[PDB]
From a paper:
In this work, we describe the rational design, production, and characterization of K1K1, a novel minimal MET agonist consisting of two copies of the kringle 1 domain of HGF/SF in tandem orientation. On the strength of the structural, biochemical, and mutagenesis data available, we rationalized that a covalent dimer containing a tandem repeat of the K1 domain of HGF/SF could constitute a minimal and stable MET agonist able to diffuse effectively across tissue boundaries owing to the absence of the N-terminal domain of HGF/SF responsible for high-affinity binding to heparan sulphate proteoglycans (HSPG). Therefore, we designed a linker to bridge the distance between the C-terminus of the first K1 domain and the N-terminus of the second one. We chose for that purpose the four–amino acid long linker, SEVE, which is naturally present between kringle 1 and kringle 2 (K2) in HGF/SF.
Both proteins crystalized in space group P 1 21 1 with K1K1 having two molecules per asymmetric unit and K1K1H6 having one. Structurally, K1K1 and K1K1H6 are nearly identical with a backbone root mean square deviation of 0.8 or 1.8 Å, depending on which of the two molecules in the asymmetric unit of K1K1 is used for alignment with K1K1H6. One can envision a binding mode in which two MET receptor monomers are brought in proximity by binding on opposite sides of K1K1, forming a 2:1 receptor activation complex.
Residue numbers in the entry: 4 to 171
The structure:
């Protein structure tokens, strides 16, 4: 996970370059800047290698001591986590808006019985977000999110949604 949530208190990624483009000094190094932010004094904050970190929780976000002797420390510019349209595992928790199947067929709305009559109504699956015609995996089947299809010859089909890469 190379994105930050909020100010990146939980950031444990591998970015090692500051906002202005300076290579980070290793946390366990005293060169060029002497400091006390050592891994042994900040257990759980993962002050490893020279990765940008926010061990105390400050505004700018994750930061590091810089290899430039003239710049003691500088914040790093890491993108905010914005991933959405992806699935974790087989997507029991998927609640995005993909509405086409793996074969390219437009999904039938869950509350519609046309062309396919079925039982997967929102009122019978409260909490599964069977809204609009979005792909869903309400019963937790290994096929991933699926939908009834608008092709009268294809009752249902799993959709094609890639795995996430920013969850944890």
């Amino acid at each position: 996970r190379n994105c930050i949530i909020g100010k990146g208190r939980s950031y444990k990624g591998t970015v090692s370059i500051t906002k202005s483009g300076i290579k980070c000094q290793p946390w366990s190094s005293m060169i060029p800047h002497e400091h006390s932010f050592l891994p042994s004094s900040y257990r759980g904050k993962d002050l490893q290698e020279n990765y940008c970190r926010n061990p105390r929780g400050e505004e700018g976000g994750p930061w590091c001591f810089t290899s430039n002797p003239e710049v003691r420390y500088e914040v790093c510019d890491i993108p905010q986590c914005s991933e959405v349209e992806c699935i974790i595992g087989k997507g029991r928790s998927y609640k995005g808006t993909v509405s086409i199947t793996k074969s390219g067929i437009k999904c039938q709305p869950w509350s519609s019985m046309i062309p396919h009559e079925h039982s997967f109504l929102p009122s019978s699956y409260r909490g599964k977000d069977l809204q609009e015609n979005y792909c869903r995996n309400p019963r937790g089947e290994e096929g991933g999110p699926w939908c009834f299809t608008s092709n009268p010859e294809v009752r249902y089909e799993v959709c094609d949604i890639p795995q996430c890469s920013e969850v944890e």
